[PDB]
Amino acid sequence: DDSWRGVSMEAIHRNRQPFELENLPPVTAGNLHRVMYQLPIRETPPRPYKSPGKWDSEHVRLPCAPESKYPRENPDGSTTIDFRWEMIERALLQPIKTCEELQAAIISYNTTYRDQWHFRALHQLLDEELDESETRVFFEDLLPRIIRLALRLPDLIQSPVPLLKHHKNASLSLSQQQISCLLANAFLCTFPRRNTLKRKSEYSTFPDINFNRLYQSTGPAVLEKLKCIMHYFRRVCPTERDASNVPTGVVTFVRRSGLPEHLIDWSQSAAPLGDVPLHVDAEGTIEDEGIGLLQVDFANKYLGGGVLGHGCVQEEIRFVICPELLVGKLFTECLRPFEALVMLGAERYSNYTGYAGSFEWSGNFEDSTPRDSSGRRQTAIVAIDALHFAQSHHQYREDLMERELNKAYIGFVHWMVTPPPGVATGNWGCGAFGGDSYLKALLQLMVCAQLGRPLAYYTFGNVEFRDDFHEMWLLFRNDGTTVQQLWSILRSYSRLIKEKNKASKKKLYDFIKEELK
Ligand SMILES: [Cl-]
Ligand SMILES: [Cl-]
């Protein structure tokens, strides 16, 4: 009569309370860890760290930077070159009473995009979705708050914000407050040099950050993501009265970049697959039931995927109910094959129903997840990007099974002295992305086996698959099957499929009871 099979949740936690095992070391400022606030944290919210600003190829181009210049065409037809931040202030402190004036204000410092940008999702939310009185509240209450917060960027960010590039193991930690400010800037499309669509541009290996592409999109899932974002700002912006609602803590972003040294040779892993404490659940979610665990983000190589766009599946949804993740887009270069991004601290602000086109904001969430010693909520998320397959069969290539093993490997490494909590994951890169649920569950088990991590796997309503995966773990447990041995069998399946879901699991049966004599 239970939703789950395999080992129990208490067991995934080693019969120790959730949150006793940590997923990241404490924040310390170092050569490889930049921290945007003063350590140790005395006052809350954390006090900003002060150092000389940077306008260069190694750091975020901040909208408030004195180096940021902009041409303005004037009434009289002439050019004035001015400081773009000063133009931004002037635009955003004019009164703004309608959606057309908001767009015109934003365009006034983005004039290149005058006839390319149209904020149709914002027009749809404010002119068609909301009643006259909720729209008046957006322009009299919320938008003024977002502007005031955006304009405090030079007060809240007083040190350079580094980019987390390719092939560099590095961490960045910011206050939730600092992130709210950066995001208010993105909402108002203020980030310089991050708008061009030209193919071989400065930041073309970085995700989008200005919210314009969200505003350009259509359909109800998009309006619902806007509602999540509106709500985030209502939660985290100071009210006219007081700033007591402003979030108190910290978020840490860690780029994991594996060296060739770190690559596992999978045909040498002597790790027994059945020794993995496996908990497979057909109800529940990673974000709810996976507390204390390393929760997986079924990521795009560009962090956040199409969250600022039409995207509304597992990654995008997590980035709008926990919007502080969005700031990763500002500074995180796209993930190479042996890289991952760990995100610890992101507060949840919203509840939701549905998935893809049915996705809806369904109310306020008051996150009471306890904070670590560093002031981070103990919500640890790893972004690992699966491959997409137009052709299902391609994924059975040995090279692309190994690519996925190694992607999940770099995501799931621990590299701490204390022992690792379990991973909370599910159907990674499956459904419409082409991944085989059955294969991807095994790859994830192989990785967890090898690293000595429990695995809580969520099948999101699929009892059938819960059982086939549980059953295969039992078969490995009392056959004492090993990683290198399942790898061997999996390589066999590679060469069989090159001649031509439920079939991957039938052939292991076969290549496994042939051993049983
Ligand atoms: Cl001006
Ligand atoms: Cl610009």
Residue numbers in the entry: 26 to 525, 533 to 549
Q: Which of the paper's sentences describe this entry?
A:
The comparison of the dParg with the mammalian hPARG and mPARG as well as protozoan tParg structures shows a near identical active site architecture. The position of the catalytic loop (loop 1) is isostructural in the compared structures, while the diphosphate-binding loop (loop 2) is known to undergo conformational rearrangement upon substrate binding. Loop 2 appears to crystalise in the open position and closely resembles the apo mPARG structure. Substrate binding is further accompanied by repositioning of Phe868 (Phe458 in dParg) and His821 (His413 in dPARG), which are displaced from the binding cleft and contribute to the coordination of the distal ribose. These findings suggest that there are no major structural differences in coordination of the ADP-ribose moiety or placement of the catalytic residues and hint towards subtle differences between PARGs that can remove the terminal Ser-ADPr linkage and those that cannot. Finally, we investigated structural features adjacent to loop 1: two loops located within the accessory domain were identified that both support loop 1 positioning as well as accessory-macrodomain interaction (termed AD-loop 1 and 2). The loop 1:AD-loop 1 interaction is stabilised by an extended water network in hPARG. However, these interactions are notably reduced in dParg, while AD-loop 1 is absent in tParg. Our structural data revealed that the active site of dParg is conserved with respect to mammalian and protozoan PARGs, hence indicating that the difference in activity is not a result of an altered catalytic mechanism. Together our data suggests that the ability to cleave the Ser-ADPr bond relies on subtle structural differences surrounding the active site that may (dis)allow access of certain substrates.
The main enzyme responsible for degrading the bulk of PAR chains is poly(ADP-ribose)glycohydrolase (PARG), which hydrolyses the acetal bond within the ADP-ribose polymer, but cannot reverse the protein-ribose linkage. We further show that while Drosophila lacks ARH3, there is a striking evolutionary adaptation of dParg that confers functional equivalency to both human PARG and ARH3. The dParg structure is composed of a central macrodomain fold that harbours the predicted substrate binding cleft as well as the catalytic residues. The macrodomain is extended by a highly structured and conserved accessory domain so that the overall domain is composed of a twisted, mixed, ten-stranded β-sheet flanked by two predominantly α-helical sub-domains.
